[PDB]
Every structure is written in C-alpha cells, then in structure tokens.
Amino acid sequence: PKIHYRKDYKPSGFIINQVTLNINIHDQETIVRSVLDMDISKHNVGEDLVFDGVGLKINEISINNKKLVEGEEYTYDNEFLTIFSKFVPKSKFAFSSEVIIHPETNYALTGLYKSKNIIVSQCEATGFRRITFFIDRPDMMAKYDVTVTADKEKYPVLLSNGDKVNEFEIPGGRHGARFNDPPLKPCYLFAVVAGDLKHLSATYITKYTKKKVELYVFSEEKYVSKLQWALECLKKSMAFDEDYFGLEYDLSRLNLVAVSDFNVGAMENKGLNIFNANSLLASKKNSIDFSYARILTVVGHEYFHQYTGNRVTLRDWFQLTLKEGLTVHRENLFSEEMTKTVTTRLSHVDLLRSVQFLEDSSPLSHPIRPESYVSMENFYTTTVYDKGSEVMRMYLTILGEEYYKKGFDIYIKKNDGNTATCEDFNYAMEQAYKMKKADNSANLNQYLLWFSQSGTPHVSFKYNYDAEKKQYSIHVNQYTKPDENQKEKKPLFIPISVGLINPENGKEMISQTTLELTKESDTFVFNNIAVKPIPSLFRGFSAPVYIEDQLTDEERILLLKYDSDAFVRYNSCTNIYMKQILMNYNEFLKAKNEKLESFQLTPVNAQFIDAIKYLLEDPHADAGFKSYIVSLPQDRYIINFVSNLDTDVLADTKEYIYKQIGDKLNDVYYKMFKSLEAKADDLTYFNDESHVDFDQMNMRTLRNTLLSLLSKAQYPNILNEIIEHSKSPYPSNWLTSLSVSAYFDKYFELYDKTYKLSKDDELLLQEWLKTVSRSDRKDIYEILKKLENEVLKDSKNPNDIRAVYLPFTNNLRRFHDISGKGYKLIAEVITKTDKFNPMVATQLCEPFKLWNKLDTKRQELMLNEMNTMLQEPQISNNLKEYLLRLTNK
Numbered sequence: 001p002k003i004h005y006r007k008d009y010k011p012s013g014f015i016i017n018q019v020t021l022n023i024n025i026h027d028q029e030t031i032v033r034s035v036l037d038m039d040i041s042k043h044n045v046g047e048d049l050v051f052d053g054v055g056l057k058i059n060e061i062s063i064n065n066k067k068l069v070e071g072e073e074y075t076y077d078n079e080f081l082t083i084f085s086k087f088v089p090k091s092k093f094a095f096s097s098e099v100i101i102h103p104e105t106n107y108a109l110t111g112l113y114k115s116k117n118i119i120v121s122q123c124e125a126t127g128f129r130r131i132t133f134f135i136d137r138p139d140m141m142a143k144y145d146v147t148v149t150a151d152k153e154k155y156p157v158l159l160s161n162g163d164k165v166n167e168f169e170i171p172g173g174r175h176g177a178r179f180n181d182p183p184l185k186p187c188y189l190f191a192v193v194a195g196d197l198k199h200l201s202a203t204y205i206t207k208y209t210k211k212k213v214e215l216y217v218f219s220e221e222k223y224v225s226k227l228q229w230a231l232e233c234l235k236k237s238m239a240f241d242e243d244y245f246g247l248e249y250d251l252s253r254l255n256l257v258a259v260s261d262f263n264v265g266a267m268e269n270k271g272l273n274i275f276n277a278n279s280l281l282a283s284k285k286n287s288i289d290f291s292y293a294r295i296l297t298v299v300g301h302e303y304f305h306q307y308t309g310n311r312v313t314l315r316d317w318f319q320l321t322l323k324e325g326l327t328v329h330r331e332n333l334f335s336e337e338m339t340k341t342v343t344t345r346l347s348h349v350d351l352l353r354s355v356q357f358l359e360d361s362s363p364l365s366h367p368i369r370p371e372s373y374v375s376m377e378n379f380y381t382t383t384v385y386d387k388g389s390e391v392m393r394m395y396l397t398i399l400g401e402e403y404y405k406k407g408f409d410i411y412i413k414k415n416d417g418n419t420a421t422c423e424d425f426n427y428a429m430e431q432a433y434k435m436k437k438a439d440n441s442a443n444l445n446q447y448l449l450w451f452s453q454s455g456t457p458h459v460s461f462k463y464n465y466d467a468e469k470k471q472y473s474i475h476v477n478q479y480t481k482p483d484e485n486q487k488e489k490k491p492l493f494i495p496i497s498v499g500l501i502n503p504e505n506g507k508e509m510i511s512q513t514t515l516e517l518t519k520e521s522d523t524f525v526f527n528n529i530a531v532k533p534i535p536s537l538f539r540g541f542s543a544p545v546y547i548e549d550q551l552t553d554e555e556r557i558l559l560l561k562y563d564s565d566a567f568v569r570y571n572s573c574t575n576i577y578m579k580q581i582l583m584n585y586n587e588f589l590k591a592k593n594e595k596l597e598s599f600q601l602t603p604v605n606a607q608f609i610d611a612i613k614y615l616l617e618d619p620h621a622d623a624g625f626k627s628y629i630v631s632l633p634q635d636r637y638i639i640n641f642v643s644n645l646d647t648d649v650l651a652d653t654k655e656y657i658y659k660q661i662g663d664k665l666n667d668v669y670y671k672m673f674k675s676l677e678a679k680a681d682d683l684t685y686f687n688d689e690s691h692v693d694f695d696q697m698n699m700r701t702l703r704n705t706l707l708s709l710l711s712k713a714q715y716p717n718i719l720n721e722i723i724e725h726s727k728s729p730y731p732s733n734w735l736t737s738l739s740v741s742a743y744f745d746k747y748f749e750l751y752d753k754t755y756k757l758s759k760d761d762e763l764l765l766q767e768w769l770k771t772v773s774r775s776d777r778k779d780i781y782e783i784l785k786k787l788e789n790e791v792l793k794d795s796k797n798p799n800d801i802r803a804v805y806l807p808f809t810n811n812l813r814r815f816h817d818i819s820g821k822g823y824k825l826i827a828e829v830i831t832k833t834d835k836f837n838p839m840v841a842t843q844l845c846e847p848f849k850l851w852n853k854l855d856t857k858r859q860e861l862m863l864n865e866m867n868t869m870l871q872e873p874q875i876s877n878n879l880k881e882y883l884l885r886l887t888n889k
C-alpha cells in the first residue's frame, strides 16, 4: 500500500497537451480509443513513462503509430502501464491505446458505469484511470476532443464536456457525437453520459457580458417532471455568484444530469454536472421537505465549483479543502441568502459540532490539509469539507464583506487559468488584510496553522466587572489537546465575534466587535460599560471551537430569551441542556454502578422550562429555531463531553430530561401543533412546482418535532392526531406519522399505508426505508430483516443500502444493544458491500468512528467487529486503510 506524502509533491516529467477519445459503447463491452499528444517537461530526468490504468484490457498500445510489444517495451500490472524510457521519445510524441472496459458490471460506480439504463462516468478523484491510460493527477492539464458512439435506440442522448461539434449516423442502428473542449482541464473533470434522457431547458442571460447560456436538466423519462426545482436552483446559483462575487458563467451551455446510482451527492464535471437523483429531483407530492434544501445546496455547490475548483483548480489532492471547503463556504452564503432563515447557519453548526468534532477527536483526526493518504476515496471528509468551510468563513469574519470580496477577487484574478494551493488563497486574503489593517507589515502567517493543525481548539472565558470604573474584562484562553499529528499544538488566530447584553433590558451595549485572539491567552477590556453585562460570545459561531462560556444557567437563560444572535441563543440552550445531561448522566451512572435501590435525580431548571415556553409562545420567533430549542443536543455532540459513554445511561438521561420538560410543556406543545396546522400545511401552492417556502417547511419541521414529543409522551388521544397526519398530502407529514406511530398498535397499519404511497417512486421509497430504519421500535431488528427480504434484497444501489442501515445506527438504545448484534449487523453489511463498492462500504463504517469513546464493553464489541472486518481476505485497500487508521494500527 503506497503512502502519498504532501511534502513529496514534484511536477511530472511529462506533459499531456491533447486528449482525443473515441468511446464506443456496445452491448457487452465498451471500447476506448485514446490518443495523447504528449511532450517531455523541463523536470524530466529520463524516467520511464508510467501511466495510471486500472482494470483496463489492452488491445494495443502505440507510440507515434508504432505498435508496442508487451514485456520488451512495456509492462502492465492492472494498475500502472510502464513504458521503458529507451522507447520514449525525447520531443513531442503521440501515445495511443485501445482498451476494453465493462460499464455494465462496474458496481463500484467509479470510472465508466451503468446506472439503470444510463451510461455515466465518475472520475474524481482517481476514476479517469479506469476509463483509459493517463497520468491521473489534477496538475496534468489538457485539451479534450471526445467522440462517443452507441446504439441510437438505447442511447439517443450523448453528452460530454465542451461544444457538440458533430453528430453522425453509424451503420447497424448506431450514432455518434463529437465534443470538443479547448480550454485546459484536469482529467477528474472529464465526463460522459449516454442514455434515453428527457430534459427541461431554460435560457440564462449573464449580468455583464450579456451572454446567452443554455441550461439543461436531464433525467430518465419517468422522473422528468421532478426537474423543475433544480432548474430554478441553477438560475438562483448563477444570479448569486454574479451578485455577490461578480462572477459570470463562461460557457455556452450547462448540463445537469440525474442518475439513480451514485456514490455521493453530485459531481462538478465542467459544463456537465452529474447528480445523485436524490440531490436533483423533487416534487411536492413525492418528496420530503428536506429534498428542497438539499437540491438548492447541491446544485449551488456544484455550480460554485465552476470558479472554485474548475477555473481555479488544484495542484494536488492535498489541496482538496481549497476547492471543497471554499465551495461549501460559497454554498453556505448562497443558501443563507436564498432561505432567509437562521436555521441554515444553525444546521451547519449542528452538523460540525456533532459529526466533525467527533471526527477530530477520533483516531481519524486530520487537519483540513492532511500530510498523507493511501486512498483518495477516503479523503473527502467532514473535516476537509465542513471544518474547511469554517476556516474559509473566518476570512470573511476577520476581513468583513468589502475586504473579503476584494481578497476573493484577488484570488480569482491571480489564479484563474491555473492550479492553486492553500497558500495561494491565504496570500490573496493577506493582501486584503494588509489593506484593511492599513499597514503592509500585517500578515496571516499564523492563519496557515488552521490548514496544518488537527484537533478542535477549546476556548474558555473568565470575566471581571468593576462597577465603579465601569470597566469590563473578558479573559480568554485557547487550548488544543495534543494528538497523533502534533505533540505540540500552537495558538491559532481565533476571531471571536462578541456582543455585550444589558441584563436589565436585553439591549446591545457595544457596537459590532470581533476580538482577535492570536495568543494562548489574552485579556480584552471594555471601558464605559454602565452595568455588568452578559457576554454574547462567538456570535454566528465565529470559529470552529469548543466554547466554554463559564456562564450561569440564569445568564444563559437571559441570552436565550433576549440575545440578538441566533447562534448564541441556540448555544446557550445547548449549554443548559449539556449541564443537565452531564449531571443526570452521572446520577444514573452512580446508581447503576452502586446497584442502588433508590436514588435522586436533579430536576430540569424550572426557569429554563419557562424560557422554552416563552419562546414557543412568541409569534415573532422563528419556527425552525423553535424546533432546535425543544430538542436535546445530538448524541454525537454529547459524546465529546463524556468518557466511556454508557449508551443505555445516556438513553435514560435523555428520557428523563424530555419527560421533565414534557410534564410541564405538553399542553403548550399540543396547542402549538394544532395552531400551526393552517400555515404549515397550506396547499395554496402545492401544484406550483417553483414556489418554495422555507419558512413554511420550518413550520412543518416544528409541527413534526412537537408531534414526536407528544407521541413519545403518550399524550392523551394523540393517536387521533397521528392518524389524521397520515392523510396529509406532504410526505414530510405522512412519513412522520409512520415514525411517531412506533409507540402505538397502529404502526404496521401505517407501515403498509405509507409503503403503498412510496413504492412507485424510487426516491420516495428510499425516504420510506429511512423512516422505517429510524423507527423507535422494540422489534426493529425483526423489521430490518423484513426490509432486507421484502424490499432491499440484493440491491447494489448505494441509496438503497444507506437508507436501510444508516438511520438505524442512530438508534441509541437498539443499535448499541449490549449483545453487540447491532455492530455485527452493520459489520456484515460493510463486508458484503465492500465486495462491489469499497467507497460505500467505508461510508457504512461511520457508526464505528466513536468506538473508543464508549463504555469499555461496547469498545470491546466494536473493536472485535472491526478486527473481524480487517481479517477478511478480500478486503479492499479503501476499507483496510480506513479501519487500520480507526483502530490505531
């Protein structure tokens, strides 16, 4: 297993200037003819010409139209084609090959593959080498001339990058299309699509150049009607990049294509973006609300790559966060502007502090720019994406909008036609920083540590107020725990967005202030502070850190009620919950350990419960925000604060806290559930495909959250409400009715009802599967067996497999059954999947990421399953690397 190191980057001894491809798709095989117009680079030292080429069947290879002989002139080991240096020309030459590949049986969904009746490619990161020979790395920029031929009846629509310059008939019912893409691109941005695709189309006229852009969105015939929202999202994305960044689309056409079998959400192939159907297709009748936000995000994200990824590309894969982190940041800005709801930012924070913080405190912890990799397919992590995005967002927080935009424009203008590194971006931002600070001595050298240092910083506070002096002091400390990547951690440049709230009237006491913490600790003093304030810290979640506010619950309640910042209010609530959780957890644990016949639990703070009620009864307050306040922190957030987490004890802890709050608030919950119905379930625009109301969907979120709380509580006659909810036209509602009926004898009645409603839409059926998988059923293991036998069967569709198994892994009480049967189940699924799709197999390992954080027995059980998986003779390099790193081998 070859380990690739960041420090080892060297430019290639070769140049590829032109790629000329002929892709001939037949019934049982695809023939790929390729001519590479090549040259020797200034870095050449007379080395062998080595091409990446994985799983290719060689018919012939040639140099300058002279056929090469195997053994004497070249060797091929199914991974690398080595042409011995003595046979390699010293000037410009043509390398040519004809290879056979088999998309029909390509179940790994990388390279060229078949998804139902569509032939499609996926080349990022190292997939192009599965199509034809190449020096398969992003710094190898080339021009592409691509011809695709296929049966006309089966594959009437042929697509690749660039302009379609010819279409022709071929004897035997075949046809071809030629595509020429003159601008240079890395091979990971190559794509081809062939199928019986239907489309919706629109024309977009750019803001400044006034260029007409053809927008096409494609799917199989059955689902073409579900493409309208994606089209709207694309227009919105183009508009936002123009309006916020002054960036226009540079090409004549943009194609988006939905496929059923896809390893991730989507891929930004230049002018030919390819999507998991679940991230492009939606309808109000056949999609849950989440689909709308999801499509907006994914279409936006892949569109924003056109500049940050496509036009400015990566020098090497270690720079991944430069395109992924930056593009997530760009999508976040976009979505915040489109949705106009505080929940957009809140949801991103919620994900980071649960999923990413877990990763960063696990054996898998890495910086956003890792120092090494074995498998690129394992590199696309929440750290690279989500911490990367927070690192990119901090530049905006530090600089402000005006100077951030200046620095971003500097980055684009300077790097537009070329590859780039993280230092290039930091450099552009530093120029803006120099201009903002009004001195050319200012730098961001310390900021680079955000790229190189792994682990989550802990930021803690102490306060002082002198009433006589009207002087307030905030003393701040930062600390990152040593880990496997750095023994010595260094202080980071941490921007702390702060406000000061007057506890007497809830008013702001100071103007917008961002404290720049650049040392291990610092004291920030404020004069003319008339009364002792309550500090509002890390507004907007201004740095990706553990915040230790050292506030009392009284102070936190005041922020929750009266602060201006959504995040600080949300976080204050989070902190109140966390203090309660830790206390009750310890109480339950002590009782368990000591085998106590009786014991006491600390009740939930009554003024906190009053504050929740206050917020819930406020008409001005955001419905999405309300759904967060009535929900305890994510289990994966909680686990970062507990050693040897006993999952049964945590389940008991949550149960107690919810019961405590419900015992006081259930009547309020019910009243709200009923009063929200009219606006939440409004059908006025149900048949308007383009009318999307994020506030209304948040209202449904709140309703469904409250229904869940009331169902768990066995609120009197709530089954009546559940049954009526099942009759709603909105899948978010009727699928909720299924999940919440888990606590009632009518579960299987609704199981059958909702299955019938879901079965005839591929994506809706997958949503139903997720809903069943996540159902709080005592017989969940029996239900999963039913799903396997009756619905899933031997599907190799990643969406199907992920839907059945992943939501179940969030069942705290059942997945972590002390017998280890949950761990055994998922391990079996991972191993089975690894046989045909190593990438998805590694995704299915997610539950195991917290293995060393659990109680000693569950640690042992999880480790056993991981060692068992590692012992499988046929284990992929993908899965092996991941599990070796996770188990600290």
Ligand SMILES: CC(C)C[C@H](NC(=O)[C@@H](O)[C@H](N)Cc1ccccc1)C(=O)O
Residues within 6 Å of the ligand: 124, 125, 264, 265, 266, 267, 268, 297, 298, 301, 302, 305, 324, 328, 377, 380, 385
């Ligand atoms: C972040 C989300 C909006 C979408 C996300 N997609 C991406 O980030 C794409 O731009 C990625 N460039 C696609 C990708 C992901 C993993 C491995 C190879 C290729 C995905 O999950 O597919």
Ligand SMILES: [Mg+2]
Residues within 6 Å of the ligand: 054, 055, 056, 057, 100, 101, 102
């Ligand atoms: Mg093969």
Ligand SMILES: [Mg+2]
Residues within 6 Å of the ligand: 207, 239, 242
């Ligand atoms: Mg406009």
Ligand SMILES: [Mg+2]
Residues within 6 Å of the ligand: 297, 335, 344, 347, 348
């Ligand atoms: Mg988001």
Ligand SMILES: [Mg+2]
Residues within 6 Å of the ligand: 260, 762, 797
């Ligand atoms: Mg299917």
Ligand SMILES: [Zn+2]
Residues within 6 Å of the ligand: 301, 302, 305, 323, 324, 327
């Ligand atoms: Zn991306």
